[PDB]
Design a protein around this ligand. Structure first.
Ligand code: 402
Ligand code: SF4
Ligand code: SF4
Ligand code: SF4
Ligand code: SF4
Ligand code: FES
Length: 573
């Protein structure tokens, strides 16, 4: 038993924990900055978590263990001046202009500046930001006028992907962060997954903006601008409107998009059901053809880049079905004109994604046909939130509306795509019906759900056993391959998501304050919205989507052949 005194209050505990963790468990106020994902910035600790231990002096609470007999003061004059001096030194390298800043509303640094009334010794006012900004990437951007050199992005890249694509660099004899050799991120092994963005406490790292494309398209009188949102968006964007976590705001989004002036309100979950139609058909074909095995999902751009950069020998095993975004986009320029009369060249297709890598995918040169892009613009959940706020739309008080059904209806199988294992479960629901020529009532595959890094299961399809795996995070793909687990069984179907937890934890998602991250399981609570929708939807199999079956019946024909094969597929070499 340890007896500790903190600000003159005695505590008795048996835990082996840091001062910071004990304080947070006991409603004691200690600030922190560089401590994230259980690590601080080892090569320059920010020391914002400074506390006083009588008899020892100032220590960093984030990595100092509590000991019996400790007497801790967290708010003494010496502690305060220490922290305020460190924030002051950060202001000296920080362009403090929150007005036009894209983190103005939820910035960790602004909060600390206000809390400690910190003041620069010399305001940082660069006149040429071109040497500080890197906008070369199709997915990520760097603004080093905001960078605190807290190392959170470098540590989060290593933890989440194990690529170490985000590095410390020496530019002109001083320290920056960036890609290898300061190249454009796209030209390195970087996955463009944006987990570095999610870890950034300020506006230093951001998504590559597509707001110019959307604004210009909405302003062009001849353009018919369609919009369709990813599964994860309806489970997360409410966080940026003070609505809390785990709120289903699907109907509010549809209304907001209409008020923004979009001409048609569809949904990427419709494209998810399309992807299942092609991919589940493909899986049954590989079963009939005895291979090739395994088939990998191909809907995650971060995983595709991981395969391209690290495992190119696996590219031919990726499912040929386009991702829900790109398969939706292809149909928006072909099927949708056939039921509307629109000139296909005048259709402008915008998606809202919880993902930065989707911008790279939509901009791939071959993701077009007859000169028409599958997808013309991709905006993140964060981008849509700012678009709604800039238009002064009272999102939290909007009435519910519905999507336009022709490419907007979706089944419960498409609805769960945004969670790790969702693509697997959705695919199996259709694959089993396809292969057994039956309509099975049992459709729930809970063995592939949850936040385990690697999830494996044996499934029975048409009186034979098959091995499936769900890889939850790019770092677990490396583990799955390097450990030899890939060879320990004959796998037949493998889902890979680059982001831990699936797209609900994507790099385009709302930032979450580090304290909130310790109090709520963001990955689980966001995903629970999607599984809740699947539970209450009248159609829970992709091939039972009534608007989808009308589209295949009246336009595309049979999945995996004929017209669907020419147009809805994509292979990587
Ligand atoms: N394309 C596509 Fe996907 C779908 O449907 C999204 O939109 Fe995902 C989400 N949410 C994202 O980003 S991508 C990977 N597969 C799972 S979900
Ligand atoms: S990063 Fe934060 S402190 Fe800096 S300008 Fe933006 S909102 Fe203000
Ligand atoms: S986008 Fe992903 S892979 Fe690239 S540096 Fe950021 S965290 Fe690492
Ligand atoms: S880019 Fe963001 S997370 Fe990375 S060191 Fe700079 S402030 Fe920290
Ligand atoms: S898991 Fe989802 S959000 Fe993350 S990189 Fe893949 S598609 Fe994008
Ligand atoms: S040294 Fe503790 S939060 Fe940075």
């Amino acid at each position: 038993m340890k007896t500790i005194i903190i600000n003159g209050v005695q505590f008795n505990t048996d835990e082996d924990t840091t001062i910071l963790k004990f304080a947070r468990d006991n409603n004691i106020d200690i600030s922190a900055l560089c401590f994230l994902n259980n690590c601080n910035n080892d090569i320059n600790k920010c020391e914002i978590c400074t506390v006083e231990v009588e008899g020892t002096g100032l220590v960093t609470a984030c990595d100092t263990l509590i000991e019996d007999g400790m007497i801790i003061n967290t708010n003494s004059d010496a502690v305060n001046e220490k922290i305020k001096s460190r924030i002051s030194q950060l202001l000296d390298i920080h362009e403090f202009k929150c007005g036009p800043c894209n983190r103005r509303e939820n910035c960790e640094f602004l909060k600390l500046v206000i809390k400690y009334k910190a003041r620069a010794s010399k305001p940082f006012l660069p006149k040429d930001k071109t040497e500080y900004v890197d906008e070369r990437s199709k997915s990520l951007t760097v603004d080093r006028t905001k960078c605190l050199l807290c190392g959170r992005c470098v540590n989060a890249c290593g933890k989440n992907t194990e690529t170490y694509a985000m590095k410390f660099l020496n530019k002109n004899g001083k320290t920056i962060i960036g890609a290898e050799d300061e190249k454009c991120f796209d030209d390195t092994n970087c996955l463009l997954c944006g987990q570095c963005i999610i870890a950034c406490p300020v506006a230093a790292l951001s998504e590559k903006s597509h707001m110019d494309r959307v604004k210009n398209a909405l302003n062009a009188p001849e353009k018919h601008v369609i919009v369709a949102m990813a599964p994860s968006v309806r489970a997360s964007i409410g966080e940026l409107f003070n609505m809390g976590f785990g709120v289903d705001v699907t109907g509010k989004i549809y209304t907001a998009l209409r008020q923004l002036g979009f001409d048609k309100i569809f949904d990427i979950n419709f494209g998810a059901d399309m992807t299942i139609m092609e991919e589940a058909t493909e899986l049954v074909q590989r079963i009939e053809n005895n291979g090739p095995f395994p088939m990998f999902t191909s809907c995650c751009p971060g995983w595709v880049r991981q395969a391209e950069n690290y495992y190119p020998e696996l590219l031919n095993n990726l499912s040929s079905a386009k991702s829900p975004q790109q398969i939706f986009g292809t149909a928006s320029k072909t099927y949708y004109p056939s039921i509307s009369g629109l000139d296909p060249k005048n259709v402008f297709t915008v998606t809202v994604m919880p993902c930065t890598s989707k911008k790279f995918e939509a901009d791939r040169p071959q993701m077009e046909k007859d000169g028409l892009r599958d997808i013309d613009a991709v905006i993140t959940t964060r981008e849509l939130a700012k678009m709604i706020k800039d238009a002064k739309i009272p999102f939290a008080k909007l009435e519910d509306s519905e999507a336009d059904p022709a490419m907007g209806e979706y089944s419960g199988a498409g609805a769960i795509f945004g969670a790790t294992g969702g693509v697997m479960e959705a695919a199996l629901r259709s694959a089993k019906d396809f292969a057994e020529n039956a309509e099975l009532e049992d459709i729930e595959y809970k063995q592939v759900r949850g936040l385990n890094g690697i999830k494996e299961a044996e499934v029975e399809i048409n009186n034979n056993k098959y091995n499936v795996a769900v890889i939850n995070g790019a770092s677990n793909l490396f583990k799955f391959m390097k450990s030899g687990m890939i060879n320990e069984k004959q796998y037949h179907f493998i889902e890979v998501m680059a982001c831990h937890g699936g797209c609900v934890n994507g790099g385009g998602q709302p930032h979450v304050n580090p304290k909130d991250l310790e109090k709520v399981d963001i990955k689980k609570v966001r995903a629970s919205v999607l599984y809740n929708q699947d539970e209450h939807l009248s159609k829970r199999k992709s091939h039972e989507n009534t608007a989808l079956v009308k589209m295949y019946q009246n336009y595309f024909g049979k999945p995996g052949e004929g017209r669907a094969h020419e147009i809805l597929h994509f292979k990587y070499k």
